[PDB]
Design a protein around this ligand. Sequence first.
Ligand code: FER
Ligand code: FER
Lengths: 192, 192
Amino acid sequence: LSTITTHHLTVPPGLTPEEFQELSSSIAEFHSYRINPGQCSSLLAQRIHAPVETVWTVVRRFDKPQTYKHFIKSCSVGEDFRMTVGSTRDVTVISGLPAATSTERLDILDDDRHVTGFSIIGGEHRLRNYRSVTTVHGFERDGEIWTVVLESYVVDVPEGNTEEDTRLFADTVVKLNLQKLASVTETLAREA
Amino acid sequence: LSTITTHHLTVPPGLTPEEFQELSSSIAEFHSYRINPGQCSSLLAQRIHAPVETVWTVVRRFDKPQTYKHFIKSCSVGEDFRMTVGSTRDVTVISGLPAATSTERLDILDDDRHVTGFSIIGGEHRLRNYRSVTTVHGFERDGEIWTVVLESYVVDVPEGNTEEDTRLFADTVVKLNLQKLASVTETLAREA
Ligand SMILES: COc1cc(/C=C/C(=O)O)ccc1O
Ligand SMILES: COc1cc(/C=C/C(=O)O)ccc1O
């Protein structure tokens, strides 16, 4: 039967024990899921040497995910789009397979606590019933500032796949996109 | 009927006109192919602030492509492997589809001119009949040194795909792997 994810109870890759103990409550609040057989979940972490609000300005741009994500041919949200929960975007993915769209819905948007998340509601790709949450957190040590971005997901393991198959693929993509987020926002910071 | 690729006649993305005019003969010599209908070819470029021999030490490691490539679960070359042309490696790719192997053959290995290339001879993935060449080149300006890596390929466009589909996917992967090559070798340089 069901199980609760345990991401809030171990140190995620890319994060220090010190940082974890500061975020353990945010991980349990926003990066916990109830998974069933046939699903897999993961938590990824990325340090960014940039202020929180700098990183969040990119993370929250639901209509321009290609700003920090790879493998996006285009993204459309149609006229009269507003940055509200329930809005959707059509993401055309670069996959070496025929041109297919991923319809995605904005699930969360908290400008004060820096939390967002989305769901893949349609699309013929390898991430069926995908749902993820991203949170942005600030850190300080002797007047030095940095940010930690946490991103988790739950997703179906396709029939004929191992959980390790799907998890390793999803982790790689998320991890790669967080490195681009780091570069983009650190450049934005070092340029003012 | 057949056509010759024209990569040696335009400035590839990631390279300056100055750099191109220096490499135009190497591009025609090593990065030209005869493509037929149903194939596509591309040339990618990446500047690396590291000496040529530093970048080449990684580029030539046919048995450890995960050193600078993404989406590789593992790579095996079996005992008694030697770095000779004709050798092969089994690359297990991270693709969100079931665990599948890419058998690849070393086509070129020139330690003096810094040229290597390989062919995908077996594997059920989106890069059928893939063949690529990588060359490493040195540059100088006022005692400052940098390297340019050029990587081209030819590959089949799968039935039901646009050429733009396949090219955009292959370009993204190669481009991403060259950025990792840049980071890895620049770190290797700045550490001696
Ligand atoms: C980068 O953004 C995305 C990538 C995918 C990838 C799907 C696959 O490779 O199966 C799907 C939806 C996305 O929004
Ligand atoms: C990173 O190295 C490789 C990636 C692939 C990808 C195949 C696909 O996604 O269809 C194939 C062979 C490789 O050596």
